[PDB]
């Protein structure tokens, strides 16, 4: 019964495509509010 062959269902489609929903912090210049990425040397 089913085949694939402004649209309301845009939000649903992007969720299927993307697996990680948190924006990569490497590109952003502002550090996260509550999580610190800190390593001991």
């Amino acid at each position: 019964d089913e085949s694939d062959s402004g649209d309301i269902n845009a939000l649903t489609k992007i969720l299927s495509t993307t697996y990680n929903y948190k924006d990569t912090l490497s590109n952003s210049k502002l550090l996260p509010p509550k999580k610190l990425d800190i390593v001991r040397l």
């Binding site: 845009a10 992007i14 929903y21 948190k22 924006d23």
Partner: protein
């Protein structure tokens, strides 16, 4: 597995068989209107008579209840037994019951609904078989006495384990414990499926949305520290928001606005997800109240964006969609009100969109900039694009009117853009 464990599974399957008299007394005693001693004495004809009158009263309130009079509240349903039914018939009965619980969901405050549902509880033992649907439809009535009666006569499914303490308790379940039910990921999938059915059937009502929203919003707060668990929530609740936005009902759309806004503050998302959110928010934007809440939602999401491209121009399709639903005059009114929320990033993206795509509104850019103070870098970005416009586009009275405005306010920063660009 020990023999007792296997026999335990057998007992659950044959819960409502009514093999002997003691089993009949337990099963027939369960009631929503009567105490156990009086309930056992009653007869199906006595129960059915009262329910038929109740359905008529509900039918007057809403014509849709009249349909079940042919199917569930028929005189022939008195002699109908579920244990003797074949599997196809039982599945087919359950669909009718589930539909009834949807319609009755919003009328539980009315007394007749309690009498009409007594027939299904007594005749079809919905509290034993259709236990999940009954609990879900009456979840927002948790402070009401009716929910207390339901908990007394019902066996809680595994996903409703937190309510076991409040089964047969003087105090009603606290609002804090409802966060715990919705905190579980499995329960959210179940509630999502139920809420989806209401949207398909346009059976949603304001009290349902309000209680659903608070539980969803609070679930974010409880998981705010745990970023990993927030990530697992994104597939579920944003998928819910998409369904709510698709619904033509404005109240459903406003709930979606509430849900999306909390997520953006709680967890930063890709700009692609944010842009897709606008596409869904604006696609089905017709109600005026939804239009007002949507604009506040759109402004807030861009505020959360904190990566390069934070204030870049909207895509071509996105900008055209926004202008149609929010003409330039409306946003000027939005900025005009003194209590406008912080929207500098959106206006910066919107301002750059106008220059790229629509030159005729270049005069509007001058009005927009006066109304709102944009941040230092945001002004620099706008100056940078307008400089390119002068090189490419023909010089205009409005175009120079924008430069001289920047000359009047922070002249020096205008030179720095010019020095870096030509």
């Amino acid at each position: 597995s020990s023999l007792s464990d296997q026999l335990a599974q057998v007992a659950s399957n044959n819960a409502t068989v009514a093999l002997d008299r003691k089993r009949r007394q337990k099963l027939h005693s369960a009631s929503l209107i009567y105490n156990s001693k009086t309930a056992a004495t009653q007869d199906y004809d006595f129960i059915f008579e009262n329910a038929s009158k109740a359905l008529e009263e509900l039918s007057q309130i809403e014509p849709k209840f009249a349909i079940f009079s042919r199917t569930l509240f028929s005189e022939s349903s008195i002699s109908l037994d579920r244990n003797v039914q074949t599997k196809e018939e039982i599945k087919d009965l359950d669909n009718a019951i589930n539909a009834y619980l949807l319609l009755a969901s919003s009328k539980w405050y009315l007394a007749p609904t309690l009498h009409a549902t007594e027939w299904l509880v007594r005749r079809f033992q919905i509290h034993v078989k259709n236990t999940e649907m009954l609990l879900l439809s009456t979840l927002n009535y948790y402070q009401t006495p009716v929910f207390k009666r339901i908990l007394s006569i019902i066996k809680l499914p595994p996903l409703f384990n937190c309510l076991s303490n409040f089964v047969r308790s003087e105090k009603p379940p606290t609002a804090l414990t409802m966060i715990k039910l919705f905190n579980d990921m499995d329960f959210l999938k179940l509630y999502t499926s139920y809420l989806d059915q209401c949207i398909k059937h346009n059976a949603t009502y304001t009290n349902q949305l309000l209680f659903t929203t608070c539980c969803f919003i609070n679930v974010v707060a409880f998981n705010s520290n745990n970023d990993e668990k927030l990530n697992q929530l994104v597939p579920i609740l944003l998928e819910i928001s998409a369904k709510l936005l698709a619904s033509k009902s404005k109240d459903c759309q406003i709930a979606a606005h509430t849900i999306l806004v909390v997520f953006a503050t709680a967890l930063p998302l890709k700009k692609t997800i944010i842009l897709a959110a606008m596409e869904t928010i604006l696609s089905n934007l017709d109600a005026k109240e939804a239009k007002h809440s949507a604009l506040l939602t759109i402004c807030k999401l861009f505020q959360t964006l904190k990566g390069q491209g934070n204030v870049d121009q909207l895509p071509s399709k996105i900008f055209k969609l926004f202008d149609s639903k929010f003409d330039t005059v409306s946003i000027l009114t939005f900025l005009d009100k003194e209590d406008k929320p912080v929207c500098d990033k959106f206006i910066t993206s919107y301002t750059r969109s106008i220059a790229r795509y629509d030159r005729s509104k270049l005069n509007i850019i001058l009005s927009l900039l006066k109304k709102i103070r944009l941040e230092r870098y945001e002004v620099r970005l706008i100056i940078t694009d307008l400089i390119y416009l002068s090189e490419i586009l023909e010089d205009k009275s409005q175009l120079v009117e924008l430069f001289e405005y920047f000359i009047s306010i922070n002249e020096d920063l205008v030179l720095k853009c010019l020095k870096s660009l030509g």
